[PDB]
Amino acid sequence: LPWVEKYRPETLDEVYGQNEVITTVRKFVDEGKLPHLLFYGPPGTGKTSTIVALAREIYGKNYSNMVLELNASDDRGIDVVRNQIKDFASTRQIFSKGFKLIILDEADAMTNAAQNALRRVIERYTKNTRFCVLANYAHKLTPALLSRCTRFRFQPLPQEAIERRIANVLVHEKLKLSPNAEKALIELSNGDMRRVLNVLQSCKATLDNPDEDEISDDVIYECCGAPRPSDLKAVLKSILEDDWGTAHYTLNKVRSAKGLALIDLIEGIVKILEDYELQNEETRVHLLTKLADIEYSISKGGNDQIQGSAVIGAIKASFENE
Amino acid sequence: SLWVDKYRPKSLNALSHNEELTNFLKSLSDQPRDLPHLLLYGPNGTGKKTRCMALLESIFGPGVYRLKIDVRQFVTASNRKLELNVVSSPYHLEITPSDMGNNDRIVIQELLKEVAQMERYKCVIINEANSLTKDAQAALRRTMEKYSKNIRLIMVCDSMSPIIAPIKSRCLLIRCPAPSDSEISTILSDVVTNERIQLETKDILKRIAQASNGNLRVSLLMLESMALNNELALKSSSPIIKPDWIIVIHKLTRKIVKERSVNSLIECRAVLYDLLAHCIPANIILKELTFSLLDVETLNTTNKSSIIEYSSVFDERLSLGNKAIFHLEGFIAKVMCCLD
Amino acid sequence: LAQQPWVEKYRPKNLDEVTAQDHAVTVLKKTLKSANLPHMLFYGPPGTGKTSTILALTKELYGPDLMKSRILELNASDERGISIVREKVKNFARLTVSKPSKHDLENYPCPPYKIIILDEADSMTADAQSALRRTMETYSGVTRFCLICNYVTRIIDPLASRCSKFRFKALDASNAIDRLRFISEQENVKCDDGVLERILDISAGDLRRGITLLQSASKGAQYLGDGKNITSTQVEELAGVVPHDILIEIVEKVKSGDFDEIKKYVNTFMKSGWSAASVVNQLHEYYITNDNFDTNFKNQISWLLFTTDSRLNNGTNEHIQLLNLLVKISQL
Amino acid sequence: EKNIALKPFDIAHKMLDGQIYSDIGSRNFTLNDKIALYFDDFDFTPLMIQENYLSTRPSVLKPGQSHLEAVAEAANCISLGDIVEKKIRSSEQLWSLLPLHAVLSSVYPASKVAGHMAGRINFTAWLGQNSKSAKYYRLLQEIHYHTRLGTSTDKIGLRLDYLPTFRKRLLDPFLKQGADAISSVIEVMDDYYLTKEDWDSIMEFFVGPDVTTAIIKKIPATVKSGFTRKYNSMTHPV
Amino acid sequence: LSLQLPWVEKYRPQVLSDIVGNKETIDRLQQIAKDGNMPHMIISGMPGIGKTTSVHCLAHELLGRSYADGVLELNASDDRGIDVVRNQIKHFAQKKLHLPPGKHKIVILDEADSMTAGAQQALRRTMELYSNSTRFAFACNQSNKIIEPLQSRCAILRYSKLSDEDVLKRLLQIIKLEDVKYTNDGLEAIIFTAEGDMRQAINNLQSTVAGHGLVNADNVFKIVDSPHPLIVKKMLLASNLEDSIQILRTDLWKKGYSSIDIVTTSFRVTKNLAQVKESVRLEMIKEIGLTHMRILEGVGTYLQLASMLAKIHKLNNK
Numbered sequence A: 001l002p003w004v005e006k007y008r009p010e011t012l013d014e015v016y017g018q019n020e021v022i023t024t025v026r027k028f029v030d031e032g033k034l035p036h037l038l039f040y041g042p043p044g045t046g047k048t049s050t051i052v053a054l055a056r057e058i059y060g061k062n063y064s065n066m067v068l069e070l071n072a073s074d075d076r077g078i079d080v081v082r083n084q085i086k087d088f089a090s091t092r093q094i095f096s097k098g099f100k101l102i103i104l105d106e107a108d109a110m111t112n113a114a115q116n117a118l119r120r121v122i123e124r125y126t127k128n129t130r131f132c133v134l135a136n137y138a139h140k141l142t143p144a145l146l147s148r149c150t151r152f153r154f155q156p157l158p159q160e161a162i163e164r165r166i167a168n169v170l171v172h173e174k175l176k177l178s179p180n181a182e183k184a185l186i187e188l189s190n191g192d193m194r195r196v197l198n199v200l201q202s203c204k205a206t207l208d209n210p211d212e213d214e215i216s217d218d219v220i221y222e223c224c225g226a227p228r229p230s231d232l233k234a235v236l237k238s239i240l241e242d243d244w245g246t247a248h249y250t251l252n253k254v255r256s257a258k259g260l261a262l263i264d265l266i267e268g269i270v271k272i273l274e275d276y277e278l279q280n281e282e283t284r285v286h287l288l289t290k291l292a293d294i295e296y297s298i299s300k301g302g303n304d305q306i307q308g309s310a311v312i313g314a315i316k317a318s319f320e321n322e
Numbered sequence B: 001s002l003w004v005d006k007y008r009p010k011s012l013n014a015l016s017h018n019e020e021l022t023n024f025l026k027s028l029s030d031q032p033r034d035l036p037h038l039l040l041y042g043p044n045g046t047g048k049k050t051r052c053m054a055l056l057e058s059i060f061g062p063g064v065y066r067l068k069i070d071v072r073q074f075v076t077a078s079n080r081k082l083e084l085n086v087v088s089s090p091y092h093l094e095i096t097p098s099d100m101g102n103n104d105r106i107v108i109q110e111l112l113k114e115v116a117q118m119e120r121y122k123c124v125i126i127n128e129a130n131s132l133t134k135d136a137q138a139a140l141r142r143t144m145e146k147y148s149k150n151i152r153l154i155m156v157c158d159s160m161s162p163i164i165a166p167i168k169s170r171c172l173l174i175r176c177p178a179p180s181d182s183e184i185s186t187i188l189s190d191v192v193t194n195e196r197i198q199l200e201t202k203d204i205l206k207r208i209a210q211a212s213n214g215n216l217r218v219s220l221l222m223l224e225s226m227a228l229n230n231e232l233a234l235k236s237s238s239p240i241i242k243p244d245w246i247i248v249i250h251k252l253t254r255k256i257v258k259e260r261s262v263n264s265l266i267e268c269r270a271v272l273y274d275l276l277a278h279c280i281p282a283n284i285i286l287k288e289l290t291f292s293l294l295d296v297e298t299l300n301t302t303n304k305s306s307i308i309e310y311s312s313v314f315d316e317r318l319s320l321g322n323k324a325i326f327h328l329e330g331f332i333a334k335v336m337c338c339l340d
Numbered sequence C: 001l002a003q004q005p006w007v008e009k010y011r012p013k014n015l016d017e018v019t020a021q022d023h024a025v026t027v028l029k030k031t032l033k034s035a036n037l038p039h040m041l042f043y044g045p046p047g048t049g050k051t052s053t054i055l056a057l058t059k060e061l062y063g064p065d066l067m068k069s070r071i072l073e074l075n076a077s078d079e080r081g082i083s084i085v086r087e088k089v090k091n092f093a094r095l096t097v098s099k100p101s102k103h104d105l106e107n108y109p110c111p112p113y114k115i116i117i118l119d120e121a122d123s124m125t126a127d128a129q130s131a132l133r134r135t136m137e138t139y140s141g142v143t144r145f146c147l148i149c150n151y152v153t154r155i156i157d158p159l160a161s162r163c164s165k166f167r168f169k170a171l172d173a174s175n176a177i178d179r180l181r182f183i184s185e186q187e188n189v190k191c192d193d194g195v196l197e198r199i200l201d202i203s204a205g206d207l208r209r210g211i212t213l214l215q216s217a218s219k220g221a222q223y224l225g226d227g228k229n230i231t232s233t234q235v236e237e238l239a240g241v242v243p244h245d246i247l248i249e250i251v252e253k254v255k256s257g258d259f260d261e262i263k264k265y266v267n268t269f270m271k272s273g274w275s276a277a278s279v280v281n282q283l284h285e286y287y288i289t290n291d292n293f294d295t296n297f298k299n300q301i302s303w304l305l306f307t308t309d310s311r312l313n314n315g316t317n318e319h320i321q322l323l324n325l326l327v328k329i330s331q332l
Numbered sequence D: 001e002k003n004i005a006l007k008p009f010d011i012a013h014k015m016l017d018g019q020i021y022s023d024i025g026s027r028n029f030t031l032n033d034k035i036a037l038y039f040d041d042f043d044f045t046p047l048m049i050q051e052n053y054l055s056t057r058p059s060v061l062k063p064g065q066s067h068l069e070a071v072a073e074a075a076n077c078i079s080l081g082d083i084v085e086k087k088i089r090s091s092e093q094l095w096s097l098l099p100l101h102a103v104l105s106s107v108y109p110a111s112k113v114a115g116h117m118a119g120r121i122n123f124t125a126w127l128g129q130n131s132k133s134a135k136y137y138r139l140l141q142e143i144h145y146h147t148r149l150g151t152s153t154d155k156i157g158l159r160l161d162y163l164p165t166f167r168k169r170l171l172d173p174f175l176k177q178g179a180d181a182i183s184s185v186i187e188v189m190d191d192y193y194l195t196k197e198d199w200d201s202i203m204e205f206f207v208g209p210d211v212t213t214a215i216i217k218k219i220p221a222t223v224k225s226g227f228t229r230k231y232n233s234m235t236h237p238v
Numbered sequence E: 001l002s003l004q005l006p007w008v009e010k011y012r013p014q015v016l017s018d019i020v021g022n023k024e025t026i027d028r029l030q031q032i033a034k035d036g037n038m039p040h041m042i043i044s045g046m047p048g049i050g051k052t053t054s055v056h057c058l059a060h061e062l063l064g065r066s067y068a069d070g071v072l073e074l075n076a077s078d079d080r081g082i083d084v085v086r087n088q089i090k091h092f093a094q095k096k097l098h099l100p101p102g103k104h105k106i107v108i109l110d111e112a113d114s115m116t117a118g119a120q121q122a123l124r125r126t127m128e129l130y131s132n133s134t135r136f137a138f139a140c141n142q143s144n145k146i147i148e149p150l151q152s153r154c155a156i157l158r159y160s161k162l163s164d165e166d167v168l169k170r171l172l173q174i175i176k177l178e179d180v181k182y183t184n185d186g187l188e189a190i191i192f193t194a195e196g197d198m199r200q201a202i203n204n205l206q207s208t209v210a211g212h213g214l215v216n217a218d219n220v221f222k223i224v225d226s227p228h229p230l231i232v233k234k235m236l237l238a239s240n241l242e243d244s245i246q247i248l249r250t251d252l253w254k255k256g257y258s259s260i261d262i263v264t265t266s267f268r269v270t271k272n273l274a275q276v277k278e279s280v281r282l283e284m285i286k287e288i289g290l291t292h293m294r295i296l297e298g299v300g301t302y303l304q305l306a307s308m309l310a311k312i313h314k315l316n317n318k
Ligand SMILES: Nc1nc2c(ncn2[C@@H]2O[C@H](COP(=O)(O)OP(=O)(O)O)[C@@H](O)[C@H]2O)c(=O)[nH]1
Pocket: B004, B005, B007, B008, B009, B014, B015, B016, B017, B043, B044, B045, B046, B047, B048, B049, B050, B051, B156, B187, B216, B217, B220, D152, D153
């Protein structure tokens, strides 16, 4: 079983960092006045966790008879899932507690279906169905009829809560994680719990001895497919200190052997340089402008070697300002 | 007819310049069954189309010159019927998909599929291959892979850079440099001896070759115009005849150099509007204006460097723009500021 | 008889024929020993043997006969876009796995799954890769994916986490030159001294492009008809590479600094038909790796070349851009 | 009703007024007001600004800055705005860039050359010139289709190179020989499948010293009548 | 938990008198309705300004009752196919029903600019065939995408973005029609967030009333999913580039705000920075727009925002 499903909390009391939204939803449900719900925000914040917790709080052992979780981006088709929803709506149960609880995960990826099918689904089944809509990215929600819901924005979880959850997962899975690996995973996921769990499970899979070996930051970076800070720091040091030939050779060798794209190398170098102490602000201005220009040109194509040498020259010229 | 078309070489034996390329084409025509896809790139008016037609004549015979033209109607998506002019022979086809703009891809796909279904093989000559969209080029590569048995493409372009890498790897690169002044002079001498044109000296032909800047079509047409203007008797003092748009652009350059003011800019705008309204491309206008400005002897190095920099900037803006007069006027204003 | 490209003609048949990828080959052998084959992510420099190794692994898994019925080779750079590739993948996955014959079962393991090989995966956008991940998790039971790319960092984290990653080292120049020499000997291609080295240098170590250029040079030599050896000028011509003499003349004209002389030389040069982008690339290669220029000159010229390349990539007039670049370099 | 046509004129006159760009005038008429002026008519305001920004006497010139530098900066900004407009109109869902186009095509260039209108606010000439260019390109396409089997060139090459020689072969003989050149002109036309309509269209493509309107008018009417009668009296290749 | 209707749908303009913006076009439409003559109409304007809503108001004023089949709205880019839409239009136009002498069946074709030459010609022929029975209304983002034959036999109307005064008037009317407690700063914030978008402003007002009741700046910006204008103003007006970068990294980028929202709010704040000289504001707006174009072309990275801040600082400090 996936770790996302396995460690999803079974009760509302186990949700961390969203106390205001938890209290509001609890007040709504405890009185039997559950309205249409819309949960939007960054991924991996606990939307599905909250909905399953409230569903199990309402019904309990017979929650499977009333709830129905469907993915909007399913390859089966929007028409097929619409027919599935219409078939589930016609279902009748002896108990009158609650309503039809349909969960539409990632419903924002409906650039045509939101106005085509979602409007009809929301309108026609008002009498006996409560709808939940989940969104991750910006406002793709077609506000024309989206207003018929209770908006709820999820904020990224605090780092302490993420660390505690990671420790709980480690002690449950009998996994040992280095502190550097934990820091790298937290930085890469940037509050996305789905990414944390998926990377942890995959890294455990790659271990030859899951119960004995320790997951290092190298394993985390290999699993995530992200540039290691050590490689970026080495490239930056070679560019700043060594002459042009050595810097060019080092940059090409590192970003070809390690499979780092030039745009990702630029992003990592910028991230590292943001922490540098520079006496002259003209250095920062030149660095930012030239690197943004190079990245924009890279997006359009162009010559790769020329762009790499342009990055090296831009960094050198900017740091010539001390 | 015109001397440029009457004396066009109709066979590989009638070619006079680029002897090595002629030998290469003869060797290619020696084995018709193994003919690869070809991509001829070089300066304009150097003989690429003539050499392609000569190779086609060497392979199939003189019947390739019995050309007939037709209009093919393609019903694309949304039911927007489009008309494309196709020049066809009993042995080959010639298309210019860039005439359809962004709709070149579907036209290429449909026409190539139809030709493959109709069929040893039929040669398709695509003109202005460098101006094809990237999607059209990908479709062309796909049709090369699918229908290599019955389709042998002969693409002609002025620059190989816009061509994508898969097309380059799937074709044979043929470079066609512009002829030297001596070869152009020899060709013009042959033309004037055939037409019985009096010449005081061959230096007239040398000057025509120099003024044509290696463009053989331009040199031939200039020679015909000079002969017509001089009662079929060219003298050493005979002035070089230039096209109307080139004369207008030179006058505009002299005007820009002489005076730099807002009223001069307005009159330059009027001149540019006149040039653009009569099917003179914006890039051509910009290139001619820049290279006329750079030829002024009164300008110093700094002025010329500023002019070429502004020309590069506004050429990039022309390639990315929609209204050409805007970019041309901006370039002229920048040049006026840099000169003043 | 049909004609086949030399790239696909000389692909290694089995895993033991891969020369300079011993680490990835060993890891793939260990995975093949296991009954379960996870999703794979082959990344490394171009022309190192990623496609060759995945094809060899497939051939060992299914056998020469069943291989063609279990493989869907797709390219992510398809101009038709995300929809066509994803629909093709879905159609391939939906179709039931073909039943292997008795001979295939008894001679080869014939695993129940089917392998989908996707090339240039890093060129996909984030949305395309997310859709690919959704399809992969939908049909994980039947289809195992293998993404081939040059940069693993261009693949989103959710998609990369699902794939075991194999890193291919860049081929040593000796190994690439030996492979090219073996191909030339097998195909009876006459070459002068240093021609294969020039081919590798033009291809920038990419053995795929090197083999393609070698085949093109062989075709050109056959068309020449004299039976003489292939020379460096021919392979430079076929790859669109400006001769070194013209580049040296350009460098000298830039060094002299006279605007009129540079303009005249550029006007003469544009009549020879050489590509301006090749000139810019070779000027970059010459100037950046030259020990006779100080740090400031290279700092300025890198930006100059970058600006010229960016303007050339927009589809502009080559003459104007080249003249501007040369004039700007001459002013340093 | 007819004030819709005057609306772009009023917008251009208000946006080129130098009072609203001073320190005191900026407070009364803020930048939001100027962008709203653009959005009052977003189809004609950039065209009117590009047309009329050279007819002003600037009162907002910086010290040490001449009128020519201001108009050059305005033209640079107008070119950038044209690029932005092309990017906006190429693909939809990019209409969020409309304020940026407003600033780049209407507000900023007016800021650089704001002052007193030297003459009158003239309507944009780009629309008529664009229609004229489209008509002449259609005529050139028809001529190229007619002459494609005899000439080895593209449409642009036909315009730039072949047309002067066609003029020398089809109009100069009339001038230098009266009606005796009708047979030669008809032969040259038949060698390229040129009709009388194509002959009329060809002479309209010439600019500068090569304009042919006055020259054609000066040709005697008897010569033209004989030319058309002889053309209509014989069959021609198709 | 009971039957509810959103304020956007409840207070949508049902008649011509309910429309606040574009007073000249509204006056022309009112004159047309009063005259009792309905000709073919074409409305052109930037998308999202409710062009078809004015046509709906005109149809409501003219037809009155019998609104079931008298008015039909279809999308020119409907996924069902252009041919299907054209056949439906022909069937509806050929279907005649008893109507007053001055009234005719109205067919509205939204996004008609995306149609091709052949489809437009076929629809023009269909409209001319049923001219006396059905009047054709076309809504286009730009009038240049509609062929000249359609333009010649249609009345062209120009629709523009609503001004801030019209949005404020509509919001005040909605507040009066509801039980809304509001303050000046809250309405100013709502108008600031919705740049002439009436529907967005109404949705934001309804959400604020539902969530917090009282309408003030803090509640409005808590409801709105865009960066807070005070934070963006502090980032833009910081005298030190490092402070601007720090604010961008902490309060905007790490808070989950997308780059598009960041550049849009930066444009909005710079446009209204009354304490800065207008030339500096124009330079900053130019830089913000350049980075907005770069983001919309695909490069929605943090480096572009940092470079935008660097250029703005360079302009500010000269
Ligand atoms: N006599 C002679 N004329 C040539 C030769 N090559 C080209 N030309 C002339 O050059 C003119 C234009 O060449 P063209 O086919 O348009 O070449 P392209 O436009 O560069 O592809 C033709 O009309 C020919 O008359 C040659 O080898 N000999």
